[PDB]
Curated annotation (Swiss-Prot):
Similarity section: Belongs to the peptidase S1 family.
Domain Peptidase S1: 1-221
MF annotations from Gene Ontology: metal ion binding; serine-type endopeptidase activity
Protein name: Trypsin
Length: 223
């Protein structure tokens, strides 16, 4: 996250870190047994790390739970990143407490200008790279579909939304992918792509989660 701030410890209790020897993507706890993330974060083995703030220190709220099932959206396009969503079933249920909690799937798609919270352990520098120990946060609004399409002519599908700032300076970046965009207590976005990060008129692009409530409930019921 570039241009953000360090989250209060455990104040984003649905944020997970996906770990394969080190942190490589974010995700969101949506059920005691299920995490949603980006299909481009797919690996055949993933350890889900819940209750993190410092991913480099055991602070005593962590639960490390291996993935038992990893299911990418059947229409995920690895090139365009259309349908950039996957579900991870945990090998045992996460215990839900104040530090580890689910986030609601959306009632409706978010209106333009809805304030959201984006989080992750991705790069914090727009010039060079620095990877944080501590979970970073960013307040950012949903952008209109017109603004999103003007930033990326011909590249925005119906499954994509832009969230952030056209002026630059404030965006998700490398290592945030798969993580949450939460607006009024509902998961509206998954960190997906952008043209670099925090550049002028290149806002972050996010998987439009409100398109996938049917697919998620189906997948949970089937597995
Ligand atoms: Ca930790
Ligand atoms: Na981004």
């Amino acid at each position: 996250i570039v241009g953000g701030y360090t989250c209060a410890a455990n104040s984003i209790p649905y944020q997970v870190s996906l770990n394969s020897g080190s942190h490589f993507c974010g995700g969101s706890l949506i059920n005691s047994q299920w995490v949603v993330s980006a299909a481009h974060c797919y690996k055949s083995r993933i350890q889900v790390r819940l209750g993190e703030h410092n991913i480099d220190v055991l602070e005593g709220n962590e639960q490390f739970i291996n993935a038992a099932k990893i299911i990418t959206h059947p229409n995920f396009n690895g090139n365009t990143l259309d349908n950039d969503i996957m579900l991870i079933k945990l090998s045992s249920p996460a215990t839900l407490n104040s530090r580890v909690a689910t986030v609601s799937l959306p009632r409706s798609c978010a209106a333009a200008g809805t304030e959201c919270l984006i989080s992750g352990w991705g790069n914090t520098k727009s010039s060079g790279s620095s990877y944080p120990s501590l979970l970073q946060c960013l307040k950012a609004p949903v952008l209109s579909d017109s603004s999103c399409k003007s930033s990326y002519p011909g590249q925005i599908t119906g499954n994509m939304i832009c969230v952030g700032f056209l002026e630059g300076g404030k965006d998700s970046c490398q290592g945030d992918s798969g993580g949450p965009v939460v607006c009024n207590g509902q998961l509206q976005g998954i960190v997906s792509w952008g043209y670099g990060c925090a550049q002028k008129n290149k806002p972050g692009v996010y998987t439009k989660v409100c398109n996938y409530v049917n697919w998620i409930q189906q997948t949970i019921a089937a597995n």
